[PDB]
Amino acid sequence: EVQLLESGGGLVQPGGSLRLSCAASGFTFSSYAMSWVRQAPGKGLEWVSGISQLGGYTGYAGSVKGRFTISRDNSKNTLYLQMNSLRAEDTAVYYCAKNRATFDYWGQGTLVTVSTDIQMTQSPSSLSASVGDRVTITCRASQSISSYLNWYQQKPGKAPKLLIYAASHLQSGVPSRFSGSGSGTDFTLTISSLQPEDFATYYCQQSQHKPLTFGQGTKVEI
């Protein structure tokens, strides 16, 4: 039912410009804040920008401040990211996502190639296990964040998916072998019995304070 369809990526020279589009369907687009999150090749997820329902409030990561502009056209159910003065450091897959701080749906990602914060730390950074094993992943916040903690799963080549929100709530449709626990500064995601489709990188993310930050990712290999 919910789809976020991205377009507009490509290859540009340093200093160049691109515009990304994210077409939404299956939910009431104008009722939700919308966001952009990027991922440089082989690296973790990084929040880039967000925009309120009617466009009056926007936010940008410090590194793109003044060069990127987020906008939306509610009458076309479309979110945009205008990217000027592109730098090598901007090379990444760009995801749009629904909501401000709990990203319950993600676009498929579009590749752009140019050629005080709350720190989240995950343990382990990677692990190799076998079908049927129990896996636990720890996420620590550098300050107390109560229950404002989400978990995402990202299979190789794919967009992230929300698994757990607000520390312990199972997102609709997620298998019950996934569970979340914890509070304050220490949180855990548990996969009670690892299935073959669970090989993926898992990310925690605090939803309480700007700028939004992700853990570095835990790669679960088989």
Numbering used by the authors: 3 to 117, 134 to 240
What text comes from the article?
The M2 is a proton-selective ion channel, and it plays a pivotal role in the uncoating of the viral core during entry and viral assembly. Four distinct clones (AU1, GU1, JU1, and UU1) were obtained based on changes in the CDR regions.
All the scFvs superimpose with RMSD ranging from 0.358 Å to 0.498 Å. Interestingly, no significant conformational differences could be observed in CDR conformations. All scFvs demonstrated binding in the sub-micromolar affinity range. Interestingly, our results showed that scFv AU1 could stop newly formed virus release from the infected cells while interacting with the N-terminal conserved region of M2 in a dimeric state. It is possible that antibody scFvs, other than AU1 do not form similar dimeric interactions with the epitope and that could explain their inability to inactivate the virus.
